[PDB]
């Protein structure tokens, strides 16, 4: 016989190995695929459909279908932002229960960009322009319009186009960032404010809604596999 | 075999892969631990906020691998595990909450009060970090004023170099259960280039 | 997980100066600003106050205004609503909430308190 030599492993099962074993079946007519519209090939493809944001998560609007409905209200110039999302997956609440935010929560890093989708749903006549601003990393959430408009940022015309897009690059210190609340490494902050105000047509109701969408561009990436599952 | 000449050295490389520059520290380290809080309670002290001056100064581990070196540039990625508890011994409850992590680039104002304007920053970039999902992360590409930062810096002008301020507090308004929060923090320098080599520092920090 | 609990939320007579309180759990304080914002009964939430402990950056509704106090604390990472000289329109149930923020807004917030009622009620 071959004089063969049993190494260290030998007689252990690997969970994630990959080996051949016997098929307790031979010849078994497996009954063949077809072309069933929708097949997948990848996770990372789920993320690049947009998912739409909640983000009223308030007392009585969560878990209730308004956690959706962002509502310009007929309220004055305060300076303080319509909306300010933070860019940190994990470490902020709002953006973990987006699809995009479903599969990062079966890893630990993620890379590329993610962009943000606006669509107005305000009467048609209606009018105004909005100013979707965003803050790198690391720098405090803008306050101010001002302040806000001298970062990177977008005058969005609700007159003009209904939905607005505004990609977020990914402008990061390491080449992979985490999934984890260990720190708040504050990235980014997509912040809403009042460039002008809303115009209304004669008296069509004064306090219409937004809705927004986040998803993965085609260079979003992610890695080590890691999971939490309970009971 | 038993060989004593003088020649140069003997044969030639053999592999030394995982030795270089980028490899060596490629392995994230803890630098701090932040913690925060969601005081219902007036503590004026842990008060929601919690800055760190982003130094490697503050942990050995990075210290001394780091100071093998005179000069260098990296690109820093961060990586922000945060985990949560319920302080008080009571079964009271709360809902997930979203953690702001504040980058501030180097030379700005930093943050006091967890209310004012500079939390609001039309420019510094932030991190909205829901709980219970894989940690966050953002990169900081080289931001020295130099061509190099000074591990060592020779002469007068200790605040070596700068690399930055992180803020974070908790965004979710103030729950009757209150609820403590550590936000450790991770640096994994990449794309490292190092300059003139030292001694090693021998004692302690 | 963030924990915000909602404590010192019972019954005033018009003109009361009751004050509220809200610890803050897996963060610190100084990352996320903190406010207030109430159901008023059968109406939609309005912003109180709001402010962010890292330099304490003050602002309040424009009913609330003056009478109210919010402040915080960063060793105990609570926040403190001098809740002075109370109106009948006040009888609304508050709510401690974590922003970025750094004020009043339906939105930009993340956690949230379980809820309380201060009944301003003689």
């Known amino acids: 016989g071959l004089p063969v030599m049993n190494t260290p492993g030998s007689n252990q099962y690997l969970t994630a190995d990959n080996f051949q074993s016997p098929c307790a079946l031979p010849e078994f007519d497996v009954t063949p695929p077809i072309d069933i519209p929708g097949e997948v090939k990848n996770m990372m493809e789920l993320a690049e459909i947009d998912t739409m944001i909640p983000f009223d998560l308030s007392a009585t609007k969560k878990n209730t279908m308004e956690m959706y409905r962002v509502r310009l209200s007929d309220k004055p110039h305060t300076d303080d932002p319509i909306l300010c999302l933070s860019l940190s997956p994990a470490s902020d609440p709002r953006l973990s229960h987006t699809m995009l935010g479903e599969i990062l929560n079966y890893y630990t890093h993620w890379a590329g960009s993610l962009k943000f989708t606006f669509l107005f749903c305000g009467s048609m006549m209606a009018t105004g322009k909005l100013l979707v601003s965003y803050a790198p990393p690391g720098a405090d959430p803008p306050k101010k319009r001002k302040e806000a408009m001298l970062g990177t940022h977008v005058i969005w015309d609700i007159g003009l186009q209904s939905s607005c897009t505004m990609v977020v690059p990914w402008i990061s210190n390491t080449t992979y960032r985490q999934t984890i609340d260990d720190s708040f490494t504050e990235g980014g902050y997509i912040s809403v404010f009042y460039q002008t105000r809303i115009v209304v047509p004669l008296s069509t109701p004064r306090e219409m809604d937004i809705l927004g969408f986040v998803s993965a561009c085609n260079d979003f990436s992610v890695r080590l596999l890691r999971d939490t599952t309970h009971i | 075999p038993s060989d004593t000449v003088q020649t140069r050295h003997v044969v030639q490389h053999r592999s030394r892969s995982e030795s270089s520059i980028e490899s060596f520290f490629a392995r994230g380290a803890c630098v701090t631990i932040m913690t925060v809080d969601n005081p219902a309670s007036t503590t004026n002290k842990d008060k929601l906020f919690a800055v760190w001056k982003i130094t490697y100064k503050d942990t050995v581990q990075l210290r001394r691998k780091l100071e093998f070196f005179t000069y260098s540039r990296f690109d820093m990625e961060l990586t922000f595990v945060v985990t949560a508890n319920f302080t008080e011994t009571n079964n009271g409850h709360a809902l997930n909450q979203v953690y702001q992590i504040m980058y501030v680039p180097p030379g700005a104002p930093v943050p006091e009060k967890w209310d004012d304007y500079t939390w609001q920053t039309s420019s510094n970039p932030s991190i909205f970090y829901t709980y219970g999902t894989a940690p966050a992360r953002i990169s900081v590409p080289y931001v020295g004023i130099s061509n190099a930062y000074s591990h060592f810096y020779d002469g007068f002008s200790a605040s070596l170099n700068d690399f930055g301020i992180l803020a974070v507090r908790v965004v979710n308004d103030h729950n009757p259960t209150k609820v403590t929060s550590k936000i450790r923090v991770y640096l994994k320098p990449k794309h490292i280039r190092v300059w003139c080599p030292r001694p090693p520092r021998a004692v302690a920090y | 997980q963030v924990q915000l609990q909602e404590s010192g939320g019972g019954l005033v007579q018009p003109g009361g100066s009751l004050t509220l309180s809200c610890a803050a759990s897996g963060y610190a304080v100084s990352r996320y600003s903190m406010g207030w914002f109430r159901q008023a009964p059968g109406k939609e939430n309005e912003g109180v106050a709001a402010?962010?402990?890292?330099?304490?950056?003050?602002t309040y509704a424009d009913s609330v205004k003056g009478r109210f106090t919010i402040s915080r604390d960063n060793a105990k990472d609570t926040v403190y609503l001098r809740m002075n000289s109370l109106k009948p329109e006040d009888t609304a149930i508050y709510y401690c909430?974590?922003?970025?923020?750094?004020?009043?807004?339906?939105?930009?917030?993340?956690?949230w308190g379980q809820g309380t009622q201060v009944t301003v009620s003689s």
């Open positions: 402010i962010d402990s890292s330099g304490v950056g003050t």
């Open positions: 909430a974590s922003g970025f923020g750094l004020s009043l807004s339906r939105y930009t917030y993340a956690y």
